[PDB]
Design an enzyme around this catalytic site. Structure first.
Site, PDB file in Angstrom:
ATOM      1  N   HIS A   1      39.472  -9.942  62.874  1.00 19.62           N
ATOM      2  CA  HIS A   1      39.740  -8.594  62.383  1.00 19.62           C
ATOM      3  C   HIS A   1      40.410  -7.761  63.487  1.00 19.62           C
ATOM      4  O   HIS A   1      40.145  -7.980  64.671  1.00 19.62           O
ATOM      5  CB  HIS A   1      38.372  -8.014  61.988  1.00 19.62           C
ATOM      6  CG  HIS A   1      38.426  -6.664  61.370  1.00 19.62           C
ATOM      7  ND1 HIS A   1      38.533  -5.516  62.124  1.00 19.62           N
ATOM      8  CD2 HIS A   1      38.346  -6.269  60.077  1.00 19.62           C
ATOM      9  CE1 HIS A   1      38.542  -4.467  61.316  1.00 19.62           C
ATOM     10  NE2 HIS A   1      38.439  -4.898  60.069  1.00 19.62           N
TER      11      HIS A   1
ATOM     12  N   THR B   1      43.605  -1.549  60.209  1.00 18.34           N
ATOM     13  CA  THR B   1      44.388  -2.755  60.486  1.00 18.34           C
ATOM     14  C   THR B   1      45.886  -2.402  60.583  1.00 18.34           C
ATOM     15  O   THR B   1      46.593  -2.884  61.468  1.00 18.34           O
ATOM     16  CB  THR B   1      44.155  -3.763  59.363  1.00 18.34           C
ATOM     17  OG1 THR B   1      42.759  -4.040  59.260  1.00 18.34           O
ATOM     18  CG2 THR B   1      44.814  -5.122  59.687  1.00 18.34           C
TER      19      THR B   1
ATOM     20  N   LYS C   1      32.023  12.328  43.055  1.00 22.61           N
ATOM     21  CA  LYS C   1      32.494  13.503  42.321  1.00 22.61           C
ATOM     22  C   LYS C   1      31.375  14.051  41.444  1.00 22.61           C
ATOM     23  O   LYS C   1      31.342  13.816  40.227  1.00 22.61           O
ATOM     24  CB  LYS C   1      33.731  13.158  41.495  1.00 22.61           C
ATOM     25  CG  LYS C   1      34.875  12.555  42.308  1.00 22.61           C
ATOM     26  CD  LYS C   1      35.868  11.828  41.410  1.00 22.61           C
TER      27      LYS C   1
HETATM   28  N1  LIG Z   1      35.126   5.157  64.099  1.00 21.72           N
HETATM   29  C1  LIG Z   1      35.188   5.148  62.751  1.00 21.72           C
HETATM   30  N2  LIG Z   1      34.536   6.052  61.998  1.00 21.72           N
HETATM   31  C2  LIG Z   1      34.585   6.072  60.652  1.00 21.72           C
HETATM   32  N3  LIG Z   1      35.288   5.202  59.934  1.00 21.72           N
HETATM   33  C3  LIG Z   1      35.981   4.253  60.573  1.00 21.72           C
HETATM   34  C4  LIG Z   1      35.984   4.171  62.014  1.00 21.72           C
HETATM   35  N4  LIG Z   1      36.774   3.164  62.402  1.00 21.72           N
HETATM   36  C5  LIG Z   1      37.234   2.621  61.267  1.00 21.72           C
HETATM   37  N5  LIG Z   1      36.780   3.284  60.161  1.00 21.72           N
HETATM   38  C6  LIG Z   1      37.042   3.013  58.728  1.00 21.72           C
HETATM   39  O1  LIG Z   1      37.645   1.741  58.631  1.00 21.72           O
HETATM   40  C7  LIG Z   1      38.848   1.841  57.881  1.00 21.72           C
HETATM   41  C8  LIG Z   1      39.837   0.824  58.404  1.00 21.72           C
HETATM   42  O2  LIG Z   1      39.290  -0.449  58.080  1.00 21.72           O
HETATM   43  S1  LIG Z   1      40.064  -1.713  58.670  1.00 21.72           S
HETATM   44  O3  LIG Z   1      41.365  -1.749  58.024  1.00 21.72           O
HETATM   45  O4  LIG Z   1      39.262  -2.827  58.301  1.00 21.72           O
HETATM   46  N6  LIG Z   1      40.335  -1.525  60.237  1.00 21.72           N
HETATM   47  C9  LIG Z   1      39.421  -1.081  61.087  1.00 21.72           C
HETATM   48  O5  LIG Z   1      38.275  -0.725  60.835  1.00 21.72           O
HETATM   49  C10 LIG Z   1      39.855  -1.117  62.485  1.00 21.72           C
HETATM   50  C11 LIG Z   1      41.038  -1.720  62.912  1.00 21.72           C
HETATM   51  S2  LIG Z   1      41.206  -1.603  64.606  1.00 21.72           S
HETATM   52  C12 LIG Z   1      39.748  -0.730  64.634  1.00 21.72           C
HETATM   53  C13 LIG Z   1      39.152  -0.204  65.913  1.00 21.72           C
HETATM   54  N7  LIG Z   1      39.599  -0.640  67.086  1.00 21.72           N
HETATM   55  C14 LIG Z   1      38.877  -0.139  68.109  1.00 21.72           C
HETATM   56  C15 LIG Z   1      39.064  -0.248  69.478  1.00 21.72           C
HETATM   57  C16 LIG Z   1      38.156   0.309  70.376  1.00 21.72           C
HETATM   58  C17 LIG Z   1      37.049   1.024  69.899  1.00 21.72           C
HETATM   59  O6  LIG Z   1      36.178   1.553  70.808  1.00 21.72           O
HETATM   60  C18 LIG Z   1      36.810   1.179  68.509  1.00 21.72           C
HETATM   61  C19 LIG Z   1      37.726   0.638  67.590  1.00 21.72           C
HETATM   62  S3  LIG Z   1      37.671   0.673  65.917  1.00 21.72           S
HETATM   63  N8  LIG Z   1      39.123  -0.575  63.487  1.00 21.72           N
HETATM   64  C20 LIG Z   1      39.288   3.269  58.159  1.00 21.72           C
HETATM   65  O7  LIG Z   1      40.295   3.691  57.224  1.00 21.72           O
HETATM   66  C21 LIG Z   1      37.986   4.040  58.130  1.00 21.72           C
HETATM   67  O8  LIG Z   1      37.610   4.241  56.767  1.00 21.72           O
END
Ligand SMILES: Nc1ncnc2c1ncn2[C@@H]1O[C@H](COS(=O)(=O)NC(=O)c2csc(-c3nc4ccc(O)cc4s3)n2)[C@@H](O)[C@H]1O
Ligand SMILES: [Cl-]
Ligand SMILES: [Cl-]
Length: 539
Positions: free
Chosen positions: A241, A339, A439
């Site tokens: 991921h 992503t 909602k």
């Molecule tokens: N910190 C957060 N708080 C709340 N929601 C969060 C979030 N991170 C992702 N999300 C949720 O995941 C969704 C995305 O889902 S996903 O496509 O599967 N991708 C991800 O969740 C995704 C891709 S890269 C990534 C990160 N990389 C990092 C590098 C260092 C670090 O300290 C923390 C992080 S989080 N997260 C977002 O749209 C949001 O809804």
């Protein structure tokens, strides 16, 4: 437009060369230093930087000798294992796109995913092999399956070492191998799949330019972690991921020892922290339940731990603050990304804290919050949809122009699908996904806010919230709850507890169901469809 928030300049400018060239440069430094790159926390196996680099170079050459050309495709299908990044790095070294997947994918997910990325070779774990063989019956263009995590041939398939030996000159010298330069902004490096999609996985195309941008963030003194020998990061994040991929590749650029932990019991977590003198942890917030509850902390030498970082899913402010307090840290660091943005584009800056904040806009990025209806930008302390723009934006989905167009608008802004706001100091707060808002009458209730209240209860181990259809009100908030071992709460006890802590609108009018596991995706996001199905069934 003063409503646009613009990230600062990076301490380290983006370097020249492909992502493969940059990884080779840094990995060779740490190899010559004699450092350890990967450690399996449970078995204690180590791979040094020298070994990892050598095998990656040798596999790169092997893939070329096999006949793969620039812009060809390979895949992985594996749970986390210490060998996972060898095919990733080899692909980056030679300009062959790599499509990572996990053994935990369902067959419907895996056949779809690999059907989109069309890998010539799949590097499968032993555990994933049966699924890969099944998928190959549909995706008949998969020519070869190589066993990733075996030192010997397995079930009639070549293991990684065999594939390398059979496809390189005897006495081949990795030191002679040359990384392949590519058109950085155009050349696909990785084809990734998000977790928690309501539909089947799309292939997200990430380029070398996307990845070398990440490399600047990863080592940044404010927005990343600095190079410092002896840094050991305990990671529990899925490698296939984006969260696991780009934290881990960043840690290799940083010279860290990646301490991969695949077992999540409190004892193994804490023993791992102590035994490998872990300085950093990276996790999904699902893991905090164990940490706030543990009665074992002072049985372990945790003096080396200086940072806990969370990503992937909403983190309850109160849960995070309790855990930071227990470990005597100032706070939990956070990153937020998609992503489709490669990695985190909002990260808590070192030395610039704010209670509850998701962080600030990373170097080279811009962010805004838009009104859900007008799509116009908003000032501080106004909730709306977070939009971002910058050089980690994906090239586009594979063979899905309509989906690309829906995500990235005509002005080049990526619409995250998340609700958030920024405060006067430009700290961003990510609330929840737009699609998850309940909602109830004219309200739009974020499940994460109710989940936070539920998780804070000492008898509640885990919770997920979704909306129950209702003829009068539209949707009613309801909860699925996992009770702590030895504890009981009735539906009424849970509802009354929540009612004591929240607004009238946020009451769990849709009721409570008790389960063994809250339905969630691979990085901790609530599966709303699955929750709604549980809530629909009568007790
Ligand atoms: N910190 C957060 N708080 C709340 N929601 C969060 C979030 N991170 C992702 N999300 C949720 O995941 C969704 C995305 O889902 S996903 O496509 O599967 N991708 C991800 O969740 C995704 C891709 S890269 C990534 C990160 N990389 C990092 C590098 C260092 C670090 O300290 C923390 C992080 S989080 N997260 C977002 O749209 C949001 O809804
Ligand atoms: Cl998820
Ligand atoms: Cl998932």
């Amino acid at each position: 437009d003063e409503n646009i928030v613009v990230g600062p300049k990076p301490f380290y400018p983006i370097e020249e060369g492909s992502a493969g060239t940059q990884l080779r440069k840094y990995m060779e430094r740490y190899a010559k230093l004699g450092a350890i790159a990967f450690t399996n926390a449970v078995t204690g196996v180590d791979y040094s930087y020298a070994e990892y680099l050598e095998k990656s170079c040798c596999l790169g050459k092997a893939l070329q000798n096999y006949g793969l050309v620039v812009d060809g495709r390979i895949a992985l299908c594996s749970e986390n294992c210490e060998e996972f990044f060898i095919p990733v790095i080899a692909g980056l070294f030679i300009g062959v796109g790599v499509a990572p997947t996990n053994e935990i994918y369902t067959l419907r997910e895996l056949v779809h995913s690999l059907g989109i990325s069309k890998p010539t070779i799949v590097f499968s774990s032993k555990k994933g092999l049966d699924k890969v063989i099944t998928v190959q019956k549909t995706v008949t263009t998969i020519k070869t399956i190589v066993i990733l995590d075996s030192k010997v041939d397995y079930r009639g398939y070549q293991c990684l070492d065999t594939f390398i030996k059979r496809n390189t000159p005897p006495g081949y010298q990795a030191s002679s191998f040359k990384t392949v330069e590519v058109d950085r902004k155009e050349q696909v490096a990785l084809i990734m799949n998000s977790s928690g999609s309501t539909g089947l996985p799309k292939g997200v195309q990430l380029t070398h330019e996307n990845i070398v941008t990440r490399f600047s963030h990863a080592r940044d003194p404010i927005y990343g972690n600095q190079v410092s020998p002896g840094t050991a990061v305990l990671t529990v994040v899925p490698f296939h991921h984006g969260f696991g991929m780009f934290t881990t590749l960043g840690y290799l650029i940083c010279g860290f020892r990646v301490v991969m932990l695949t077992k999540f019991d409190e004892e193994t977590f804490l023993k791992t922290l102590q035994d490998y003198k872990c300085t950093n942890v990276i996790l999904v917030p699902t893991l905090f339940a164990i940490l706030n509850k543990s009665e074992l902390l002072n049985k372990y030498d945790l003096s080396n731990l200086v940072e806990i970082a969370s990503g992937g899913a909403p983190l309850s402010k109160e849960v995070g603050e309790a855990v930071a307090r227990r470990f005597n840290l100032p706070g939990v660091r956070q990153g937020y990304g998609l992503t489709e943005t490669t990695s985190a584009i909002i990260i808590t800056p070192e030395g610039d804290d704010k209670p509850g904040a998701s962080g600030k806009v990373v170097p080279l990025f811009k962010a805004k919050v838009i009104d859900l209806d007008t799509k116009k930008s908003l000032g501080p302390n106004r909730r709306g949809e977070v939009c971002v723009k910058g050089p980690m934006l994906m090239k586009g989905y594979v063979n899905n122009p309509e989906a690309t167009k829906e995500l990235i608008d005509e002005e080049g802004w990526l619409h995250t699908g998340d609700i958030g706001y920024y405060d006067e100091e430009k700290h961003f707060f990510i609330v929840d996904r737009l699609k998850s808002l309940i909602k109830y009458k004219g309200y739009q209730v974020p499940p994460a806010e109710l989940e936070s209240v539920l998780l804070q209860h000492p008898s509640i181990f885990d919770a997920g919230v979704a909306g129950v259809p209702d003829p009068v009100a539209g949707e009613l908030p309801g909860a699925v709850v996992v009770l702590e071992s030895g504890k009981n709460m009735t539906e009424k006890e849970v509802m009354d507890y929540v009612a004591s802590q929240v607004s009238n609108a946020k009451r769990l009018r849709g009721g409570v169901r008790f389960v063994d596991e809250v339905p969630k995706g691979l990085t901790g996001k609530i599966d709303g469809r699955a929750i709604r199905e549980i809530l629909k069934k009568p007790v």
